[PDB]
Design a protein around this ligand. Structure first.
Ligand SMILES: O=C(c1ccco1)N1CCN(C(=O)C2CC2)CC1
Length: 171
């Protein structure tokens, strides 16, 4: 059976309990924690590409008020479709399953200024989603897993000083 497990789930849950934040910048900022998954039940012989996108979680934006995240108004129009191709793509099942798949180089941005970046709306909540695309498949089979532990609010600057401190502690 195909199984995609979140790595460092305990670390992600430490951030999620505070409400996770990821910085977005003009030039793009790498994530901490880094999304990493373990994979079993691929065809070791088949070739696959790994894609990453970010799904908008809510029909509203968020605001940090009195040390609490609360609904902060109507959402901006959805960020454009941005898919990140894992740089090991395409590769054998055996490649993806032999060691955890790390999305260490993906950059989150609030400006479409190129460079394979992911455009996100500040003060909106997103949930990372990984797609496994089988290569040379006339049916273009794709599997999609969501990672609820990895939900975060995109921010131009950290709102919660406990998040700022956590990011420094574990990174
Ligand atoms: O789908 C399965 C699974 C396990 C047994 C039968 O199916 N898993 C395990 C739980 N997962 C995690 O990411 C763990 C929290 C870290 C996702 C993958």
């Amino acid at each position: 059976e195909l199984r995609v497990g979140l790595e460092e789930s305990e670390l992600w849950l430490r951030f999620k309990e505070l409400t996770n934040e990821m910085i977005v910048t003009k030039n793009g900022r790498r994530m901490f924690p880094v999304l990493k998954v373990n994979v079993s039940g691929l065809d070791p012989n088949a070739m696959y590409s790994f894609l990453l996108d970010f799904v908008a979680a809510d029909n509203h934006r968020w605001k940090y008020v009195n040390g609490e995240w609360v609904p902060g108004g109507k959402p901006e129009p959805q960020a454009p479709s941005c898919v990140y191709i894992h740089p090991d793509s395409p590769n054998f099942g055996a490649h993806w399953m032999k060691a955890p798949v790390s999305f260490s180089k993906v950059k989150l941005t609030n400006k479409l200024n190129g460079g394979g970046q992911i455009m996100l709306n500040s003060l909106h909540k997103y949930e990372p989603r990984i797609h496994i695309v089988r290569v040379g498949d006339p049916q273009r089979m794709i599997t999609s897993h969501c990672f609820p532990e990895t939900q975060f609010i995109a921010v131009t600057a950290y709102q919660n000083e406990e998040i700022t401190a956590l990011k420094i502690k574990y990174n």
